Amino acid sequence: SILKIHAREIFDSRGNPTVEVDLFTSKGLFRAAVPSGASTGIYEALELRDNDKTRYMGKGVSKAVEHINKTIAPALVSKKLNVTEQEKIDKLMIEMDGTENKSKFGANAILGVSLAVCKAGAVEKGVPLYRHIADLAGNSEVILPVPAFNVINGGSHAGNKLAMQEFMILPVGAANFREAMRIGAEVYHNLKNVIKEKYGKDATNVGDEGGFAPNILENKEGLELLKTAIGKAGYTDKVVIGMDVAASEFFRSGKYDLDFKSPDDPSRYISPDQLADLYKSFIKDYPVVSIEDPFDQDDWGAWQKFTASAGIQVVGDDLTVTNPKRIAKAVNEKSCNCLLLKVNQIGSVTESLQACKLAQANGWGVMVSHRSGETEDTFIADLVVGLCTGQIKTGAPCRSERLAKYNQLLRIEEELGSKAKFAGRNFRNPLA
């Protein structure tokens, strides 16, 4: 049923090239684009770049686009496969690539087609996208997740000393998704004033994900600002905090550098135990109910130890890279208790659903996620609803590559109507 596939180079939210795929069936044109991370774990499937330093600083993706146009497209068009057969199509592509990390075509080339196929499949069945995903995942129920807004940016997503990457607010106490959006926006706007008043207007510009990029170094200060904004906005009863440390970004031969954006100096490095205790103080002084990548992607010992003693949701991102094989090891060792789901870390919709199901079958929460480098594509909005994970982080309520997804979630809630369900305070396990 796939009649034509044509790929092109477009631009992501940082102004870097990325892959976009147009797929045609008798029902019409289906288009999807691929995201790109900045703090990408070493185990992620390969994002293929041209590396021609004279063009886009080496970041063109014309090779990936060519892999689709000269190889994947004609193969898929010849097989005359039905777009609703997601698994067969994804597997064909995985087999054609033949490599462990999709380095022959690039995970960006394979994912672009995978996503477009999925969108075409939903319309093929005359059902909403989240419903089709629900079907493919084997879910009957569908639910709106609690949104986690990265409202203060640090690490590799912002120009400041702040070492930890994301400071998120989650309106778990909202009545529904739309109120969750209203609460997120109001706290965000109150925060701009809190920051402005203390550090001046120059501290209110934004980082890659729309969060403010204040010129601070102390991660505790980041948390303190969120708490103040929450209180000022009058939502202390409905908002909790989440963090994404992206510790792999400041891992230094065994230790950690909480000032890695300043000229190196090993004398300031701290040990994993020191970092673990720092988080515990954060968990003690602030409503922090979730921490992502508290340690390096392969510092397995620290992860297991922290997850066993922190008492909160611990999210694996670079640790697991949406990879069933890495996930299996994490479940066995209890390295974490939540999976960050990034379709582009593994490269296909099918492997992404497999990774989600493996995590969910083992009592893990699952938070669907965007990449710091996004596009106007809104696939993950339908994905988190169809996978019933109950939680999603897709940016601060600023910069449309973020709001496109939130707005889509608002449209899904509306479409679901009176029978719409919202995870709320049960985001970790929405379907008890």
Choice between 1 and 204, CB closer to its own copies = 204
Q: With CB cut-offs between 5 and 8 Å by kind, which of its own copies, Mg ion, none does residue 11 bind?
A: its own copies
**∠ Cα 330 334 339 (to 5°):** 55
- The interface with Mg ion within residues 317-336 (CB under 5 A) comprises 317
H/E stretch holding 163: none
Choice between 90 and 186, CB closer to its own copies = 186
By CB under 8 A, tell whether 14 contacts its own copies: yes
Which of 101, 228, 376, 420: binder of its own copies (CB under 8 A)? 376
Number of CB atoms found within 10 A of residue 249's CB: 24
Give yes or no for a contact between 177 and 410, defined as CB atoms under 8 angstroms apart: yes
What are the φ/ψ torsions at residue 249 (nearest 5 degrees)? Answer: -75, -25
Q: With CB cut-offs between 5 and 8 Å by kind, which of its own copies, Mg ion, none does residue 244 bind?
A: Mg ion
Strand partners, 23: 5, 30
Catalytic-role residue among 342, 351, 374, 421: 342
Contact region for its own copies (CB under 8 A) — 84-92, 179-187, 240-248, 332-340? 179-187
Give yes or no for a contact between 140 and 188, defined as CB atoms under 8 angstroms apart: no
By CB under 8 A, tell whether 410 contacts its own copies: yes
# residues near Mg ion by CB under 5 A: 4
**C-alpha distances in Å from residue 110, one per residue of 11, 46, 101, 168, 377:** 18, 10, 11, 31, 16
Q: What share of the chain is helix, strand, coil (3-state, %, to 5)?
A: 45, 15, 40
| Strands 255-256, 251-252: pairing kind | antiparallel
Min. distance of Cβ 193 from its own copies in angstroms? 9
Helices then strands, each counted (H, E), the chain: 14, 14
Number of CB atoms found within 10 A of residue 233's CB: 22
- The interface with its own copies within residues 55-114 (CB under 8 A) comprises 55-57
Q: With CB cut-offs between 5 and 8 Å by kind, which of its own copies, Mg ion, none does residue 63 bind?
A: none
- Any known ligand binding at 292? yes
By CB under 5 A, tell whether 20 contacts Mg ion: no
Choice between 326 and 402, CB closer to its own copies = 402
Choice between 30 and 279, CB closer to Mg ion = 279
Choice between 58 and 254, CB closer to its own copies = 58
Contact region for its own copies (CB under 8 A) — 106-114, 120-128, 237-245, 402-410? 402-410
Nearest to 69 by CA among 106, 38, 122, 124: 106
H/E stretch holding 132: helix 129-137
Q: Which amino acid is at 363?
A: G
Q: Annotated catalytic, 342?
A: yes
Which of 400, 420, 425, 429: binder of its own copies (CB under 8 A)? 400
Taking CB under 5 A as the rule, which mask of x and - marks residues 21-50 in contact with Mg ion?
A: ------------------x-----------
Give yes or no for a contact between 296 and 308, defined as CB atoms under 8 angstroms apart: no
**C-alpha distances in Å from residue 147, one per residue of 42, 49, 336, 407:** 27, 31, 21, 12
Q: With CB cut-offs between 5 and 8 Å by kind, which of Mg ion, its own copies, none does residue 261 bind?
A: its own copies
Contact region for its own copies (CB under 8 A) — 167-175, 201-209, 264-272, 382-390? 201-209
Nearest to 90 by CA among 303, 391, 354, 267: 354
Which of 7, 73, 115, 396: binder of its own copies (CB under 8 A)? 396
The footprint of Mg ion (CB under 5 A) covers: 39, 244, 246, 317
The residues annotated as belonging to the active site are: 209, 342
The footprint of its own copies (CB under 8 A) covers: 8, 10-17, 20, 55-57, 158-161, 181-182, 185-186, 188-189, 196, 200-207, 210, 213, 215, 261, 374-376, 396-401, 403-404, 406-407, 410-411, 414
